[PDB]
Each structure stands twice: as structure tokens, then as C-alpha cells.
């Protein structure tokens, strides 16, 4: 058993923003945690490396993980195009929460978000599966390049990612 740690090393224009370190709550949502873990290691031959934080809304969240269309419209999971909502046990309790983006019920793919506030109106609709344990300052740097529409000012790239533990 164990709750994985993963990392995202984020850069823009080949200049580092820093590292974000996330705990995945495999104790509660092991299927969802495993998808994210594997997308970080790249062990299935696709995953987050090279993809961007495409939608960044200050005072809300940073969204990433579309490594197929590169704009919010895509992504895929290690289980197929989509997989069901595993459970809604974990809630959007505050800043640093890691949760799945979706296109409605049972449509988890690869896209995800990191909260910068509590987002409890998403409870019961988005599967929470972890949280940031180091690098919230990095997340705040990402946020500085976002906008109300969510458009970013530059390509914010997950240049490397993987599993720490």
C-alpha cells in the first residue's frame, strides 16, 4: 500500500518555474491515483511530459494534462478514452487540492486541476485524488501567467514529470 508522490517540473521558454510535488491518495481512489501516476512516469508511452497548463484562472485553479490536442479538448487515460468516477469521498477542501477535470459524469481522461482556493461546489462532480505537498509557490508562479478567461500568456510546459515515492 502507499500513497504515491509525483512531481511536475514546469518551465516556460526553457526557463524553469520549479517543481510541484503531489501526493496521490491511492488509499481512497487507487484507480484514479494509478492513472495519474502512470501518466507521470510515461510507462504506457503517453503522458504528461511535454504538455501544458492550458487553462489558468487566477483565484481559482490551474488546469493541465491535454497531451493529445494541447488545448483542453483532449487527453486519454490508461484505461481507455475515459473512465468512471471512482468515488467522491475526498472533497475540494482548499488550496493545493488535485482533482480530475471532466466533461460530465464518468468522463475522466487525463486532464486535471490544482486548486488555489477551496472549490467545494465541485464536490460530488469531480474526483479529488490528491494534493500538493511542496511547490505551492510554483503553482502561484503559474497562476501569474493566467487570466479571467483562463488563457495563458505563454506556453507553461510540464518539461519533465515522474514519481518520487
Amino acid at each position: 500500500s502507499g500513497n504515491p508522490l509525483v512531481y511536475l517540473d514546469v518551465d516556460a521558454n526553457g526557463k524553469p518555474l520549479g517543481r510541484v510535488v503531489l501526493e496521490l491518495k491511492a488509499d481512497v481512489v487507487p484507480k484514479t491515483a494509478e492513472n495519474f501516476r502512470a501518466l507521470c512516469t510515461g510507462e504506457k508511452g503517453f503522458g504528461y511530459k511535454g504538455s501544458t497548463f492550458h487553462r489558468v484562472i487566477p483565484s481559482f485553479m490551474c488546469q493541465a494534462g491535454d497531451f493529445t490536442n494541447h488545448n483542453g479538448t483532449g487527453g486519454k487515460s490508461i484505461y481507455g478514452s475515459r473512465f468512471p468516477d471512482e468515488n467522491f469521498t475526498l472533497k475540494h477542501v482548499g488550496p493545493g487540492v488535485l482533482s480530475m477535470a471532466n466533461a460530465g459524469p464518468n468522463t475522466n481522461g487525463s486532464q486535471f486541476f490544482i486548486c488555489t482556493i477551496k472549490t467545494d461546489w465541485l464536490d460530488g462532480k469531480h474526483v479529488v485524488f490528491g494534493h500538493v505537498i511542496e511547490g505551492m509557490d510554483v503553482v502561484k508562479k503559474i497562476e501569474s501567467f493566467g487570466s479571467k478567461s483562463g488563457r495563458t500568456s505563454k506556453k507553461i510546459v510540464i518539461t519533465d514529470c515522474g514519481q518520487l515515492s
Binding site: 481559482f60 488546469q63 483542453g72 479538448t73 487527453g75 471532466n102 466533461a103 486532464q111 472549490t119 483562463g150
Partner: peptide, 11 residues
């Protein structure tokens, strides 16, 4: 508004 979706991006 403040949603996190994949395709139909909403208010």
C-alpha cells in the same frame, strides 16, 4: 463561472 471541464468550457 468557475468550472473545470474538458471540451465544453463553461462560465
Amino acid at each position: 463561472x468557475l468550472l473545470v471541464x474538458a471540451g465544453l468550457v463553461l462560465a
